[PDB]
Amino acid sequence: VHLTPKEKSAVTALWGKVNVDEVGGEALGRLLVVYPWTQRFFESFGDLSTPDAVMGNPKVKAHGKKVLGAFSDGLAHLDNLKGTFATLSELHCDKLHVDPENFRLLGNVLVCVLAHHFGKEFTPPVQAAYQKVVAGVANALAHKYH
Amino acid sequence: VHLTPKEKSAVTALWGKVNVDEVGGEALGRLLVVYPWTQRFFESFGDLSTPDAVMGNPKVKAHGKKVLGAFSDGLAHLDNLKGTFATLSELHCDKLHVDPENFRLLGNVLVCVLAHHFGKEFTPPVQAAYQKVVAGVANALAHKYH
Amino acid sequence: VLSPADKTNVKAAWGKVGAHAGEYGAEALERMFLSFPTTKTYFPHFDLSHGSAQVKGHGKKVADALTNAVAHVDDMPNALSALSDLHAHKLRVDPVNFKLLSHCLLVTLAAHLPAEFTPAVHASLDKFLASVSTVLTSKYR
Amino acid sequence: VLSPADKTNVKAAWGKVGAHAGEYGAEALERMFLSFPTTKTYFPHFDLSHGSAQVKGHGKKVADALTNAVAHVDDMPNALSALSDLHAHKLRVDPVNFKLLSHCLLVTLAAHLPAEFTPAVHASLDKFLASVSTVLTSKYR
Numbered sequence A, B: 001v002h003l004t005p006k007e008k009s010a011v012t013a014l015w016g017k018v019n020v021d022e023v024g025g026e027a028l029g030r031l032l033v034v035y036p037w038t039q040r041f042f043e044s045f046g047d048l049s050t051p052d053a054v055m056g057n058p059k060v061k062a063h064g065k066k067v068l069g070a071f072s073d074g075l076a077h078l079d080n081l082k083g084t085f086a087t088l089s090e091l092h093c094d095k096l097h098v099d100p101e102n103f104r105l106l107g108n109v110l111v112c113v114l115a116h117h118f119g120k121e122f123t124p125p126v127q128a129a130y131q132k133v134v135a136g137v138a139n140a141l142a143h144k145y146h
Numbered sequence C, D: 001v002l003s004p005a006d007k008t009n010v011k012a013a014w015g016k017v018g019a020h021a022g023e024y025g026a027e028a029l030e031r032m033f034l035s036f037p038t039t040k041t042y043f044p045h046f047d048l049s050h051g052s053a054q055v056k057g058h059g060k061k062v063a064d065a066l067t068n069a070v071a072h073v074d075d076m077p078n079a080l081s082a083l084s085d086l087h088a089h090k091l092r093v094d095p096v097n098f099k100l101l102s103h104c105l106l107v108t109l110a111a112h113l114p115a116e117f118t119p120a121v122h123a124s125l126d127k128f129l130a131s132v133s134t135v136l137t138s139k140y141r
């Protein structure tokens, strides 16, 4: 995916302020709360009965950190997302059989979490740059389907 | 997209029996009838007020023939759909701004028209091969978006 | 919303299915499993091969639910309430998958009922299956 | 379906929007136009640049419709019937675009109302906007 230099600047500048220990778990937790069918893939994580249970679940926070790490890796290789996400694509498509629509949903939940954390700093043009990013990640993660 | 030889065989054998003067117009007409918001892109085609009007419209039949021609071209280049659909992608994405979900819809309407025409010959494994094809075409037509 | 003509079209087309109801349901499931292999994981206790008695029996259940919806088309949220709870709560079926099965039901009807599958009836059947899908995905918690 | 808690959450969160209602609607539209440029073609008679009086005025209309839906949350198909006719018949808005604007409304609320945008309220707002979208796409003919 192609970001302008202005968009790259906006994206990288904001990402440097991201709390990498928390934002991923917040995005994964909100996915599980907002789109409850995604809990199907996380039976082994234990207590997901309430939103508080989900958000405070240590396994959700730990797995969220790995997800964010993958987004971070994508931001470093915007011109080669397919190669970057090849193994993850094999995992999520061939092994897990997650419908790729959910990759789009998690990307959009991440965008909501960034908006929540950064407030007015998450301007409409900053969002538009991040939408290019999370679309790119979703399409690359979906590569084994197409 | 990768079809097995058995799937390639099934796809090519059926496509040879397709009426290339009619099936495309039937698919485009049914798109316009079943998903009426797609009529937004065809104001210049005139009378689209009823299903009979749509299906009998000479412009729908003529434009449908071009659509089918593009599907035929895709079937000949299954291992290079991106290049095959590059100009069409530029047209439908950059110039027309058609949401790519509609590429998926038209592909699925084509699958319904093939089922209608071929009946029991359009077996579940034949369909599955055609679903790979129309997904591939939709993804290639959508390339300028991602 | 389903129009008077939609309800007439759906009742007429489904009326032609007859004793093949269960058979067509089973075929739509098979089409879905082969065309969209992600959907297979909902049925690990099923053998999904051709001629599977389990897919045959499940196709009859799917058809009976659709027949229930046709027979109670003005009261579908109520008629399908238990099934909505089941698919959304217990089974956690991804809403995308209803679009996939609905498409496979249309393909099955087209392959069997060429006289009934006119453009107008295709449109009515699509709206009907989307309405059924809307009810069955209405209970996510 | 919206639960009692969903209705409470949506009313509470939307209550905090206040005199910013029109402003937030306008910002959500701008976010949509920039993030998803396909949506721009519905507004050729609009200047879509930042500070556009037309986008500002349209944001107020969108907010007033959402406020109407909140105020009549148990009767939304009726309350939004005219708007449903407009978007589906006259304007022929692609149903995908409602998901795009709904997402941009969530982003706007998150960016402005950090205390209100809890995971539970995010879920309720998503269900509410999906319900509004379901009504506004219910009239395709």
Ligand code: HEM
Binding pocket: A038, A039, A041, A042, A066, A067, A070, A071, A088, A092, A096, A098, A102, A103, A106, A107, A137, A138, A141
């Ligand atoms: C942009 C979207 C996504 C990204 C970047 C992502 C990233 C990751 C990463 C980094 C892992 C760890 C893999 C490892 O341990 O090596 C993982 C595992 C996993 N993901 Fe995701 N994921 C995404 C979407 C999803 C969604 C939507 C679901 C389900 C609704 C899902 C279900 C799972 C599961 C169940 C695992 C555990 C697999 C295992 O441990 O064997 N993922 N994902």
Ligand code: HEM
Binding pocket: B038, B039, B041, B042, B066, B067, B070, B071, B088, B092, B096, B098, B102, B103, B106, B107, B137, B138, B141
């Ligand atoms: C797999 C999906 C599709 C294929 C293969 C396809 C193919 C084509 C072809 C071959 C043409 C003729 C281009 C030319 O004259 O050189 C065309 C034009 C056009 N298409 Fe499609 N199309 C698809 C989907 C769609 C959809 C879903 C829409 C709208 C809902 C759409 C709207 C149009 C319009 C308005 C034109 C006329 C453009 C012009 O004459 O300037 N297309 N398409």
Ligand code: HEM
Binding pocket: C039, C042, C043, C061, C062, C063, C065, C066, C083, C086, C087, C091, C093, C097, C098, C101, C102, C132, C133, C136
């Ligand atoms: C038109 C849409 C659908 C209809 C009418 C329908 C109908 C039914 C019916 C009648 C049952 C049996 C209920 C019971 O025995 O208590 C059932 C069960 C089930 N359905 Fe569906 N369904 C639909 C869509 C889907 C989809 C899209 C999926 C997943 C891809 C799915 C997955 C399942 C599963 C896993 C079961 C349980 C099977 C078992 O454990 O024995 N359904 N459905």
Ligand code: HEM
Binding pocket: D039, D042, D043, D061, D062, D063, D065, D066, D083, D086, D087, D091, D093, D097, D098, D101, D102, D132, D133, D136
């Ligand atoms: C939450 C969803 C939405 C709400 C509440 C909403 C609300 C409204 C309202 C209140 C109006 C003005 C009605 C009037 O003046 O009679 C309107 C008009 C309009 N809407 Fe929406 N809308 C929504 C989604 C969309 C989407 C997704 C699109 C397209 C991407 C869209 C395109 C339009 C257009 C083109 C007009 C006419 C503008 C004009 O010609 O002046 N709407 N909408």
